[PDB]
Each structure stands twice: as C-alpha cells, then as structure tokens.
Amino acid sequence: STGRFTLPSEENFAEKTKELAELWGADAIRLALGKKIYNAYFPTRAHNEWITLHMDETPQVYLLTDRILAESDTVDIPLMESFFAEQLKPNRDADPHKYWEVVDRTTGEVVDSANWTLDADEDTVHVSGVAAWHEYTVSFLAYIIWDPVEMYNHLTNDWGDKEHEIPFDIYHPATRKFVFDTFEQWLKDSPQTDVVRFTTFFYQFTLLFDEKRREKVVDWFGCACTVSPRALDDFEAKYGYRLRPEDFVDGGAYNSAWRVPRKAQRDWIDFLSGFVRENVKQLADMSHAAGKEAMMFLGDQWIGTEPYKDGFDELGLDAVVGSIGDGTTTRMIADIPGVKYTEGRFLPYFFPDGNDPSIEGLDNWRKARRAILRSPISRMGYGGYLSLAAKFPKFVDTVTHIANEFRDIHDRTGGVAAEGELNVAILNSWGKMRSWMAFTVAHALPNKQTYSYYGILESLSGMRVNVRFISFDDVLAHGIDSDIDVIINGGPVDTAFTGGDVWTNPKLVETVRAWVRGGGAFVGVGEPSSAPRFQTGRFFQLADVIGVDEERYQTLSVDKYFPPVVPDHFITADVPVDPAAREAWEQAGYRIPLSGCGGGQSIKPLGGIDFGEPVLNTYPVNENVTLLRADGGQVQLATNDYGKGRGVYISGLPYSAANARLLERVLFYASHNEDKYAAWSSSNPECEVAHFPEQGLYCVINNTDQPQKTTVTLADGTTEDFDLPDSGIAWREA
Template sequence: MDIKNKGGRLTLPGEENFLKETIELMERWKADAIRDADGTELPEEVKDLDATIYTKYFVARGHNDFARENLNECQHFYLMSDRITATEDTLIIDFMSGYFDKQIKPDYDNDPKTWWEVIDRTTGEVVPVKDWEYDTENHTVKLNKAVPYHVYTLNFLAYAIWDPTQMYNYITNDWKGVERDIPFDIRYKKSWEYAKTALTKWLKENPKTDVVRFTTFFYHFTLVFNQLGLEKFVEWFGYTGSVSPEAILEFEKEYGYRLSPEDFVDEGYYNSIFRVPTKKFLDFMEFQQKFVTDRAKVLVDLVHEAGKKAIMFLGDNWIGTEPYGEYFKNIGLDGVAGSVGDGVTLRVISDIEGLEFTEGRFLPYFFPDTFYEGNDPCIEAVDNWTKARRALVRKPLDRIGYGGYPSLAYKFPKFIDYIEKVADEFREIHEKVENGKSYKSAKVAVLNAWGKIRTWMPYVVAHGKRYKLSYSYQGITEALSGMDVDVEFIDFNDIRNGIDESIDVIINAGDAYTAFSGGSEFLDPVVQENLRQFVYDGGGFIGVGEPSAYSKNGTFFQMSDVLGVDKEIGFSQSTNKYFMSEVESHFITKGIDEFDFGEGKDNIYALDEKTEILSYTNDQVNIAARDYGKGRSFYITGLPYSLKNTRLLKRAIHYVAHKEDELNVFYAEDYRVEVLGFTDRPEFAAINNSDELVQTKVYGKNKSFEITLQPSEMKWILED
C-alpha cells in the first residue's frame, strides 16, 4: 500500500447516505482515499470502494466504559486560582471560580497538602501548608495567617473530566445525545494496559481500515474553559495537561529533583511559548517526549503488525510527540496529517523529516458555519489555497484533503468546481517540485529561545489564529514560508556553539523579554560576541520589533550597535536625538510606496549618522539599515503579513546578505507575483498571489518575460 505515490494524492471525507455523490466527488477530484472524522463513521459501502480507507482512532478518550471505572486515572491539570487580596488575617479562596465544572474537577484523591500550593504573590513566597486548610464541599481554601493587603493564589491539581477537543466540537456543532469523552492517563499501569488491549481489539474489528489516524496520542495541548463554557486559556504547545502525581514522581527519580506546582503554573503564564523556557520546563518537556514517543511506538508497532499504516494528526493530543524534537523519529509513524490555514501551518507539516508522507487538511472544513445558504465558501477556499500554495511550491506536502460533511459542500457546485482545479494544480506542483532542484537565493536563520523544536511555530497562540501582539511578527514566518530561501530555526546555544557558516542572514524578532526576542539570553557575553562577529565578518542581521531587548548596561537593544537603533524607555530623555532624516532612496524600499508595521513599536531612535533611516514618522524611526564591519543590518518596527511586506523582507534579505545583484533571478517586478525556479531545468513558474489581474516583467535564470496573470493564476514558463 503506497500511500505517497498513489496518483490521486487527495483524501475525501466520507459520510453516511452519501454513496453516489461520494463516488462522483472521487472521480472529479481524483480522490484515492476516504476518511472519517470526529463525530462521523464511514458506512460499509464506502469502505468497499476502490480507495484507501483512513479511520480515526482515539487512544486516551472515547473509552468511557473504562474511564468511568477508573476515574482516579483521569488526566490532570495544574491550575491557578484567581488572585485574591487579603484584607484581614483570614482569607477564603474560591479556587474553582472561573473554571468550567463540566471539564475541571479538583483532585482530592491525591493529598492536597502534598500536591497543592498557596503562594503569596506579593512576596512570591510559598505559604506553609500548616497555615491553610481546604473544604472539599465548597471547593475553597482558607488561609489562617494571611498578611492583610497581600495577594494570594492557589495552585491546585485537578482532574480533566471532559476532552477539550470533543467539548469544542460538541458546543460548536450543537451535538445532542453524545456522551462526553473522559480522558485517561496512560502513564498509569491499568490505563496503559487497557490502551494496548483496546487498540488490538479495534484493529481486528476494522479489517477494512488501511490507515489508522491517531488523533493524536495521549496528552492534549492546554485548553481550559471558563464557567460559561468558553475558552479561558489556550496554549497550542502547553504541557500543563500532561502532568500527574505519577509523572512528577517518575521525573524526580530520573532527573534527581522534585517539580513543584509553581513549576507548571508559572505565575499563571503556564510556561507559554512566549516565555523564555526555564531549565525545569525544558527538562519536563524532554521527560514527557521520551515517555510519549516510547509508548506511541508500541501502539504504532501494533498497527504495523496488523498490516496497516499509522499516521498522526498534528493537533489535539499531540503534546510530547514534538515532530522537530530528537525523539519523534522513534515512534516509527508512516505519516503526519494536519490542518492548513496558511503557509506557516503548511510548512509545520511539510518540513517534518523521516516520514513516508505528509498530508494537509485544507480549508474550509465542510461545516454549517461556512456552508449555509447565502454564503460563498469559495471565498475562504481561494484565500486558503493562495496562501498555502506559496509554501507548497517551496516544500510540498505529499497529499492534501478536506474534512467535515461532504453533503454540505455538494450543495455548492461552484465550490466543487473550484476544488477540482485546486486538486489538479496541487498534483502538478508536487510532480514538478519533487522531481526538480528548487533555486534558493539565501539561507536564513530565525533566532529565538526555542530553536529547532519550534520550527515554523513561533508567535503562535492557538493554531492558525490571529492575535494582537503576534500578527506583527507572524508576518515574518508567513513571508518566509513561501520565499525562495532555505530557512532554519536556531536557539542561543547554536549561537554559543559557533554560528553555522552556511547561514547568510539571522533574524531576531519579538517583544522585549519574550522567548522570541530572547530576553535574558542576550545578557550572555558569548551570545553578543558571536553575533557581532558574524555580522562584522560579512553576515546579515535583521531585527523586528524589540530584538535583543533587555534593559542593561545603558542600552535596551543589546545589539543596538549592530542595528544602529535603540528604544527610548524613559531613562535617556535628557539625551537629545538628532538623527531624523530619511534617505532619499534605498535598495530595500525600492518600489514599495507605503508601509504597514502592524502594531509597530514607539520611540525608536537612530544612534548616529551612520544609521540609514528608511522611514521616519511621528518623531521615531520605523525602518533603518546600517553597515557593520563587512556586514549589514536591517531594522523594522513590525512586519505583519502582506504581499508588500513579503517583498520588503525579500529585498532586505538580499541587501543584508550582499546579494543585491542576484535579486533579478527568478523574480517578478510586481510585488504580487513570486517566482518558483529550478537549477536543473529551464522551466519556472510565475505565481499571482493576489485576486487581481497582473501584468508584469518576470525574470528567469537568464531571461526576462512580459506576462499577464489572471487572479490567483500560476503559469509555467519555459526559458529556452
């Protein structure tokens, strides 16, 4: 069963009472596989079609008969109560306030005096256990020696009694009569034995299944709901839902120290991706990765022994798998599938190594919130395909597909026609790119505190969603996802250990003190020394937002000498800033008549006359460039995704890498068009990323052509 090389490369969702139409869609879209989904089952007649059959499998949920009998082996969260101010020496903390009691249940089975923690948030000190008591009926904690006008919180261990993804689908799709899935923890012996036995039984009962789609394995990303059943805290990378007393005890045996509740709660930030990770959290991540990948391998081996393929859905219960971590390869998966919302989410999947195939679920999902009378689902489909295609041509997926209820999509003939064109274009791209050597104009490294393990994942709060303080940085990775450059993600140890000589440009971008700008990592002299030498010797450095920001030693941007700019944070207002004049023209901004900085940053100023100011408004620098030894730097206050900003970043990369003369190689003069070129063939493609008609000059390897592109058109051109 060669899933990767079957001609159709498209997976269609199946549905009951839809056989005739399913066959029609398979023929039109050339689908060679059919899948079920959460809340649906494939009928037998669909399983008998000439197609590869994907069937979802939930390891740690959807087994309520077992879970109800073993509620003490439910999964857990470490959670923090509201911050409560004491006004006298006694204080009552209603710690379930703000949490959804259908999802969260306090764990009193494991002694709260051992596993919970009251913290004085005014001093940061842990309150002695003898000074508080808990009430199991009212879910409260009483402090007996509170300090008046100090703020207190409780870190408490709680059972997760409803799977977050099923809960989301349950509410979104208004499911009726569906039992709520109770997630159990396979770290406990009984649950682990059950998981193996249940899968073995299921494999025998599903002989027509060709591909088992694990959704995913054991631990869900952190998703906690409030008392109204709305999302309270979401962290797509969160390990908070993988904690348990058993895990903490095993961790202590292996690593030699005990993790506290606060190590997970992290002042209420829960070790989010925006926090510079602590050693303790990195240790726990590694600990869970080893455990998850070892046990996932056992289940994958069972699937293989049954003569089936095993893939995982990159989402839901993916915590601990870490596709860019060192242990992922041990699982032995055949493939990974995931949702594709844009170029970045596509590259998160397509760049995973060591798999037989990768597969993307494109938008829109065939759900009632999109497929309803009066709406045009093609609008979302065109936007999704156009954004994803930029990345697809740089690193193709092996397969694409859709999800939801096909009977809803079938009611929209225009949409069916459009997806037919998408499927054909995808197969053409895959064939040409996989059989050619793509041109790369530079090698770019994105520097942050996470590095490789968060490849293509920086700035993400929840998968594919826009957030106010993130979008001005997400534009960087989105632009890079479809650019003709090699991209890698590096951390500060990669800087300490010596910068890879193949890197042309390093990008550091993020808000001050976050993991993405680096925070305290920039206080290490070795980091500063090696970065400065890299640029001084001819490398390129790009800073966005508050790069290298940490107020210390008289500067805010620790790399201000390289960037030629710094940020006024109030301390040096007595020092006049005289450098305000913009340069008349510059290579980086040529052809770009307006700028979008997103949220931007205020009070950026140039250090001296050596800084070239490319944009200056509101008494502050927005864009700047600077020579530094043999190298160059570029600074911009923010870079949300747009076609113009993509062009701006492309030109900036060429400039700081001293590759201006190579810009007009596989390049289009119009910023709305990008070019896919090859070093081993005379053919290239011009891609219109806009919904407008475009006439432009495009450059191949040695020749230029005047062309016209229809909205969203991709045109192949032969350079004789």
Template sequence: MTERKGRVTLPSQQNFLEETKELLDLWGADALRDSDGTKLDDEIKQLDAKIYTTYFVARSHNEFAEKHKEEVQQLYLMSQYNTAKSSELEISFLDGYFKDQIQPDYYHDVKEWWEVIDRTTGEVVDPSNWEVNQEDNKVVIKNIEPWHEYTVSFLAYMIWDPTQMYNHITNDWGDKPHEIPFDVRQPNSNQFVKDYLKNWLQENPDTDVVRFTTFFYHFTLVFNNLAEEKFVDWFGYGASVSVAALQAFEKEKGYRLRPEDIVDQGYYNSTFRVPTKAYLDYIDFIQQFVAREVKELVQLTHDSGKEAMMFLGDNWIGTEPYGKYFKDTGMDAVVGSVGDGTTLRMISDIEGVKYTEGRFLPYFFPDTFYEGNNPVIEANENWLTARRALMRKPLDRIGYGGYLSLAYKFPEFVDYVKELTDEFREIYDNIKGVKPYSGLKVAILNSWGKLRTWQTHMVAHGKWYKQAYTYQGILEALSGSAVDVTFISFDDIIENGIADDIDVIINAGDAGTSFSGGEMWKEKELTSKLREWVNNGGGFIGIGEPTAHHHQGRFFQLANVLGVDKELGFSLSTNKYFTETVDSHFITEDITTFDYGEDMQNVYALNDNTEIIDFTGGEIHLSASSFGKGRGVYIAGLPYSHENTRLLMRAMYYAANKENEMNKWFATNVHCEVHAYPEINKYAVINNSMEKQTTTVYDGAGKPYELTLEPSQIIWEEYTNEG
C-alpha cells in the same frame, strides 16, 4: 499531462454513498476518511479508495474511564488573584473555570501537591496555614498578610476532552456523552490502550490507515465558566501533568518540580515565555515517554498490515516532529490542518515519514457551510497562501474534513475544489523531490530553535496581539520565499557558533518573550559571537524589539549592529539629533505602502551612520546600518502582506550584501513570485492575488520580459541552462 486522480483524501459519512462516489470521481480522490462525529458505511469502505479511520487512543472509551477515575488525565491550574483584607482569606479556586471540564483532585494529598502563594512577595504559604473545604471547593488561609494577593495552584482532573468539548459545543451535540480522557502513564490505562488497539485492528479489516488523533496528551485548552476558551496554548504541556509523571520526573532528573514550574504565575509556560531549565527538562522528559509508548502502538499497527498516521494537533503533545525522539516512533505519515503557508511548511518539512498530508480549510462544519455564506472565498484565500509554501516544499497529499453532506450543498465550492485538487497534482508532479532555487540561507533566532520549526503561537485569538502578528507575518512571508530557512536557538549559538552557510539571521518579537529572547541577551558569548559574525560579513535583521533586555545602558543589546536603540525614558535628557531620512534605498525600491502593524515607538538612531529609511510620525520604522563588513537592518513590525513579503526579501538581500543577486528569478509585481527548479530546467510564475496582474519577470540569466497572469494563475515555463 498530470493524471487527474490521486493524492487527495475525501471525508465521508453514513448514508452518503452515491454522493461520495460522485465527489471521489470529480475531485480525483483516492482515499476516504471519517471525522470526529462521523462514521463510514460498509458500502463506502468497499469503494476504490484507501480507507483512513480516525482512532482515539486516550478518549472515547467512557466505559473504561468511569471505572478508573483515578487515572483520568490531570492538569495544574491556578485560581484567580484574591486580595486579603485581614489575616484570613477564603478562595473559591474554581471561580472562572468550566466545571463540566475539570474537577479538583482530592484523590491525592492536597498538602503535598497543591501550593498557595503570596503573589505580593512570591513566597509559598506554609501548608499548615491553609485547609481545603472539599464540599465547597474552597481554600481557607490563615495567618497571612492583609492587603497581599494570594493564589491557589491546584491539581485537577480533566473530565472532558477539550477537542470533543469544542466540537460538542460548536455543533450542538446535545446529550451526546462527554468523552473522558485517561492517562496512559497509569497502569490500567496503559494496558487498556494496547489491548484495545490489538482488538480494534482485528475488527477493522477494511481500514488501511489508522489516523491516530492523536495519542495521549492534549495541548493546553481550558474553558471558562461561560463555556468559552479561557487559555489556549497549542504547545502547552499542562495536560501531561500527573502525580505519577511528577514522581517519575524526580526519579529520572534528580529533582522535584513545584506546581509553580507548571503554573508559571498563571502564564502556564506559554510559547511566548522564555522557557526555564525546569520546563525544558519537563518537555524532554514527556517527549521521551510519549515516543516510547507511541512506538509500541505503531508497531502493533504495522503488525496488522496497516499504516500509522499521526494528526498534528489535538493530543499531539510529546510527539513534536522536530524534537529529538520523533524519528524513533516509526510513524508512516503526518497529517495536519493547513491554515496558511506557515502551517503547511510545518507539516511538509517534517522528516522521517513516508508522506505528509495537509487538511485544508474550510472545515465542513455549519459555522462556515450555512445558507448565505460563500465558502469558496475562504477556500481560495487559504489556497493562495498555502500554495506559495507548496512551491518551496510540497505536501504529498491534501484533503478536507468534516461533514461532506454540508459541502455537497454548495455546487460552486464543489467545482472550486476540483480545480484546486487538479492544480495541486500539477505542482506535485512537477517539483516533488526537486530542490528549488534559493538565493539566501536565513536563520530564525529564538529561544526554541529547531524544536519549533515553522511554529509560533498557533491560536486564533492571538492574532490581535502585535508580537504574535509580526512573528507570524515573518514566517508566513518566508514560507513561500525563494530562500532556505532554518531555526536556531540562543543556546545553539553559544554552544556551537554560527554555521558558515547562513547569510542572514532574524531576531524578532516583543521584549521579554521567547521570540525576542529576554535575559538571554545578557549572555556575553551570545552577543560577542553575533557581533563578530556580522563584522565578518553576516547580515542581521531585527524586527519589533529585537535583542531587547535593559542591561548596561542598552535596551537593544545589539544596538551597535542595528544602528538603533529604544528609549525607555531613562535617557530623555540626552538629545537625539538623527532624524533625517535617506533619499532612496534598495530596501524600499519598489515599495509604495508601509504597514508595520501597531506602532513601535521611541526607537532612535545612535549616530549619523544609521541610514533612516522610513521616519514617519516622529518615529523610526525602518533603518539600516553597516557594522564592519556586515549590515544590520531594523524593521518596526511586519504583519503578513505581499508588500511586506517584498520588503523582507529586499531587507535580507541588503543585509547579506547580495543586492545584485536579487533579480535572478524575480517578478517586479509584488503580487507575483517566481519559483525556479534548476534540476529540471523549469520555473513557475504565480499570481498570489485574486486579480489579474501584469509583471516583469527576470529569468535565471537576469533577462526581463513582460507577462500577464489571470487571477490566481500559475504559469510553468521551461528554460535552458543558458537562460
């Protein structure tokens, strides 16, 4: 019987002692934490629970930051595009930015560190032809070409921490001081963060776990003049830039970065951009520096007898847990926000820490916990998507954040969390440390490889865009599927080839993006090695615009593997005869509805060997093709759903030539899944929906039986090695 206590972290706050004790017992929590905007009373800290204390390394110390304004964190920004109507142009470069967040850097020489660019030609305007009016925050440019467009790339100080700013605005904190982030690369700041931590550790004897939130540099989050999000990149290194960093980079790497290497035509090296060598060098440079500095803070924490936990978010830039240097930091634990199965796996798959923890949604903030709303709906949806991933690689702990007093006002939610925490402990106690059954090994191929394991765009407003939607859908489907997943880059294949144990490679995304690959597909070593691998029996799945780059008469560079290409309008004079669909196909055997997201148009079959599986609206949405001993599969798009999860699973087994093995540990109902654990002779059948489901279940020996599951139910079964 699973013990109904432990592995759960409860947020609390001041003047909430009795209610905290009640929920500690009800939810079986064994740890308490504060949140941004809350503190724990001394009486609460004396309860029988581990105490997590939020610690901000490079913010919430305005008394220091105000004295060292030259050490405030910086970032490069680009002005709006401005059209010259004569040989002179005046640009108000702060237009469109939130002036409570940023201030121009006039401390350093603007002629050395800023850049004015003719965006019509891409040429840099000679600094002698422009001046800065600091009083009005304008750049005046002379001797330029009329009717060309111009931008200013400028250094700015970030005078308000983005997370505190977001929370401040969301929760209407009024005149609460704006927290100023400072740069640990600067001498005074570097010494301050270490001295302050030493004193803080001594002054907080009741703290068991220092929850670093996080360390030094925030992901790129810039607000507009309406105090709304303007640019968000959860992986953006823009806020790690400074004159000191640029000088240190030049000394270490042997060349100097331009402002354009960071501004990137206004794209700011977003996750969707194929990374340049300069940007990858900069990422590596920042990660090394951050790892060295983090290691010192972790050691101070350990010396005081406390654990060091990192929040995977906010100021996490440079601490990427799948990077080369994270293992050197000595971190005890990582905690992150769980929004779905993908984000759960991003946390639970991290190696080199003693334990991982997920902060589940909803956050206890008034944007969810208000009269008339039912937070149980969001909580249950979040749990069901995350639970699929838990069955593959469980977190060690779960918890919540925010104002506990808000959640306490919703009794139905309180009761639901009790059920959820009990179920989590049951899952953990059954399978922690046990390798689940996997029928295939699948590699996701993109520009980032292992560095961005289980990571995509990670910004909420990106969901409407089909490429982000599809890529997230693929990872979400895989996060809880009975396959092993690895992440490889194009350079991995070029330099090292393809590992022998990989059954299927998936390449997906829009043309030109880091996920699809862009100009990487011109690399002959890449395409040759992949064709050879498929020819020898490998499976290749392309989704969206895979292998896409217009080159030598092809758009899909592996069109011969996929059996399809995309018409760009250049070969409209060439007839496309092949439109007849197959009568039936393994991939769609139990699929009744199709959702590819936004339509992908103008994909056509190369010849009559291509198996067109779904041809609707005059377009190919799903097809398969043989290539030597291997197979290629094309899918137009794959937003996450239970049906699309099944579609992807069937496509993978078909591509791998292992159709006969799919019915081992299998549920016929697409809303249900089977997870087997041969090491302990157990398996679980789960209902991923909020409705009652009946399914045929195939056990490890391929024997079928009928099973009915209540909404969201999980049923554990034992079996013998003989099935």
C-alpha cells in the same frame, strides 16, 4: 494525474462519493471502491465505560485560582469560581498539603502548609496567619473530566445533552493496558481500514475553560494537562528534584511558549517526550503488524511527540497530517523530517457554518501554494460532510482545478522544492524544535499582540530563500554556520523569541558582532537583542549593529538627532509611491534642534508601509545610520553598515504581499546580495516565482484572486511578461 487526494465521506451517499472521487482523482476516503480508507482513532477518549470505574486516571492539570485580597490575618480562596466545573474538578484524592501550593503573590513567598486547610464540604481553602493587604492564590491539582477538544466541539456545535467524553491518561498502568488491548482488538475488527489516523495520541495541548463556558487558557504547545501524582513522583526520582506547582502555573503564565524557557520546563518536556514516544512507537508497530499505515494529526493530543526533535524518525510513523490555515501552518507540516509523507487538510471544512465556497477554497489554496512551492506536501484533502459540498457545483469545479494544479506541481517538479536564493536563520530560545512555530498562541489565529511578528514567518513561508530555525544554545556551542547569509531575531523584550537575559552573555554578543563584522547580516524586528536594566544607556544589546535603540526613559537628557530619511532606496523600491503624500512630507521637512527634544524628526509622515504595532521611542544611535522610515518621531525601518556586514531594524511586519517584498529586499540588501535579487524575481509583489533548475523550468504564481500583470527576470538577464488571471500559474522553460 490521479491520486494525492483524500476525499471525506458519509453514509447513504455511496453513489456521489464514487462520482466525486472520479472527478477529483481521489485515492483515499475518510468500500468496494478500491480506495485507501482512513479511520480516525482517539486513544484517550471514546470509552466512558472504562474510565467511569477508574476516575483517578483521567489527565490532571495544575490550576491557579483568582488572586484574593486578605483584609486581615485570614483569607478564604474559592478554588473553582473561575473555572468550567463541567471540565475540571479539584483532585481531593492526592494529599493537598503534599501536591498543592498557597502563594502570597505580593511577596512571592509560599505559605507554610501548616497555615492552610481545604474545606471538607466546599472547594475552598482557608488560609490563616497571613498578612493583610496581600493577594493570595492557590495552585491545585484538578482532574480533567471532559476531553478539551470534544468539549470545544460540543459547545461550538451545540450538542445539548449529548454525553460528555471523559478523557484518560495512559501514564497509569491500568488505563495503558486498556488502551493497547482495545487498539489490538480494534485492528482485528477493522480489516477495511488502510490508514489509522491518530487524532491524536496521549496529551492534549493546554486548553482550559472558565465558569462562563469560554476559553480561559490556551497554548498550542502547552503541556499543562499532563500531570498526575504518579508522574510527578516519578519525575522526582528520574530528574533528582521535586517540581513545584509553580513550575507549571508559572505565576499565571502557564509556561506560555513566549516565556523564556526555564530548566524545569525543558526537563518536563524531556520526561514526557520519552514516555509519549515509546507508546507512539508501539502504536505504530501494532498498526504495521496489522498491515496498516499510521498517520499522526499535527495537533490536539500531540504533546510529547516533538516532530522537530531528533529521533522522531525512529517512531516509524508513515505520515503527518495537519491543518492548513496559511503558509506558516503549511510549513509546520511540510518541513517535518522522518515520516514517509505529509498531508494538509485544506479549507473550508465541509460544514454548514447563498454563499460561494469557492472563494475561501481558492484563497486557502493560494496561501498554501506559495509555501508548497518552497516545501512540497505529499497529499491534500478536505474533511467533513461530502453531501453538503456536493450542493455547490461551483465549489466542486474549484476542487477539481486545485487537485489538478496540485498534481501538476508534483508532475513538473517531482516533489522537489524550489531553489532558494539565500540562507536565512531565525534565532530564538527554542530553535529547530519549534520550526515555523514561533509566535503562535492558538493555532492559525494571530492577534493584536502577535501579528506584527507572525507576519515575519508568514512572509518567509512562501519566500524564495532557505529558512532554518536555530537556538541561542546552538550559537553558543558551535558558533554561526558558515553557510548562513542572514540571521533574524525578533519579538518583544523578555520573550523566548528575543531571548531575554541571554543577551547579557558576552559570548553571544561577541559571536554575532564578529560574524556581522566579517560579512554577516543581522535583521532585528521589534525589540531584538533586548535586555532590560543590564545597561542604563543600551536596551537593544546589538543596537550598534542595527543602528537603532529604544528609549526607555533612562536617557531623556540625551538629545536624539535623526538624519534625513532616504526615500529612494533599494529596500523600499517597490513601496507604492503616492505623490501628494511624499510632497507633503518634503514640504513640512524636519524638526529644528530644540533643547531637550533633539532634532531631525520629520514633521509629517512619509507613510506608505504598514509596520503593525508601534515600538515607541526607537531612535538612531548615530547620524550614520540610514533611516528608511522614521515617522511620528520614532523609527520603523533602518539600515546600518557594520564592517563588511549590515544590520537592519524593522519595528514590526504584518503579512501582506507588500511586506513580504520589503522583507525579501531587506534580506538581499543586508547580505550585500543586491545584484543577486534580479534573477528569478517578479516585478509585481503580488506574484512570486519558483525556479526549478534541475528540471529546467520556472513558474510564476498570482498570490491573489485578481488579474495581475508581471515581468519575470531570468538568470540570463532576459525578461518575460505575464498576465495572470485569478490564482493563476504559468510555467516556462529555463
């Protein structure tokens, strides 16, 4: 129809915005047009005139120095040598001996404050009475004198000499009053503004730069940049113990979300969230009283908001808007409960950095569309310079097609989600609060270390099943909900995502085993249920369930015997064959048992599947485990029957259409639901089907810019053939 679209604007372009709004069925702009007007609002910056007179009220952060080697009983530790001095400055106002910590990293012990001094004229700490040949660090408070995101944009775009925006912390009453008074006045001064687009609120996700103007530390969920002597003293009075600098710097980990969460972290999250939420409610209330909608950007200063924790609905936010990078980041936005609507800001950004922009635009659409069919988002839009995009007529036509397809989905489905064929729960330390947020370091930027696991979320994001996120605490307190078909546990050992020492809790192991034994399904990816040193002979504590353990060089005396790999199986049914590869694998056969080397490992790989980063020396726990891929003398893919249920091991799973199909088949197989797989399935992995039963229709989508041929199988057993063009979509009667 028309609507559900946010068109960005600029000056001296009033005429073409009218044409592009008319062409794109836009109902919002970021004046006489009758459009909803969005205004970005930046609560903690844009007022150097305030903060320069109150410089002790900028946000602060605990910073950890480089490790400095003592070569006798004294050592000097430079504070600022590894940090960007334009962004960060040591706090000399708050008593260093009270607020800072010098640590001997070699022993883990805190150096007595009587044994170190801060230099009067240099940013350097002198430590005396120390042990030679140990490494020492300082953890110190630092003011953030440049708003991290503004700084990133400055550096990236090369804003040269432009004045640096100094950020402020509303935890201080003088600054808080300033902010609310300013917003009050701003509202009165902006009668044209229909939506306050808060970008964002009060605390920046951890984002620190080094002396070379490069990113030094980043965590999209990190709350490093949220301390002050006042907050820390108040925490102590509220929680009943004092936080150490170490509770923030975390030996150099800075409380990465990959770390197994500690009590101190959760307490700090609780404390910060209570404060942030009340102030956000106040901002929402002021916006509402002025007759405007309040919308939050899912990012930047989003720390303490916790959109997936209970009570978020109480803030009365009208909307969440977020960055659509892929399916996972789409679901991050779409699944948020307790706002009236959601918006994705789509790609490409309308920005200069011959080229055909339609390609990226249609790709972004596809990456997200498959997620949207599973969990609809209310609105779409783009950001930036609308005059720049007006130049590329093929891109404009692209957008008209997308906005239409977007509205047509809504018209056909009424914004109902597609029906899900199985209930899948991802189990980790965080649970619901980090829904779709597992494995992220930097937003939308998976890397070598993370992509073998992020691929699981990415596959699931657009899959025809219902995904929920549960924690070990949920499971321990309530058991496993009776409606769950499959639990997934995945990640490296000693992370929040596998769980760490929670696996040495016999109650957890009893609950899972009993549940799988009764008909449950457990899928372990990478190093599932891992717990180091607990048992000499068992690393994955649920190795018995999935039929696979990892050799950790404690069991090399025990010969490992691999059963023959099963090349024709339901799980691998869609993996493109490759006759000459299979032939070579069959001809080379399996190792003969040899002293100290076990036996039965294939001499050549079968291949055909990309499992990402290897988990070295995985092996089957007995010869009744079904090996599906075990190339290179270790195991990538296996399945094991366990009473009435099944476990599956996957070493890793980078996203691709092939690997989403593999995981999907894993899910149906492990839950003994093979006979449920056929209904509402595409024969081609490159296409997916969304069934909308109560509207009596289904659709099939081409997940690629390729023509794709596919056969859809209906519930009634009949089949229908399709020949979808680039990014296509066909609708049928159910």
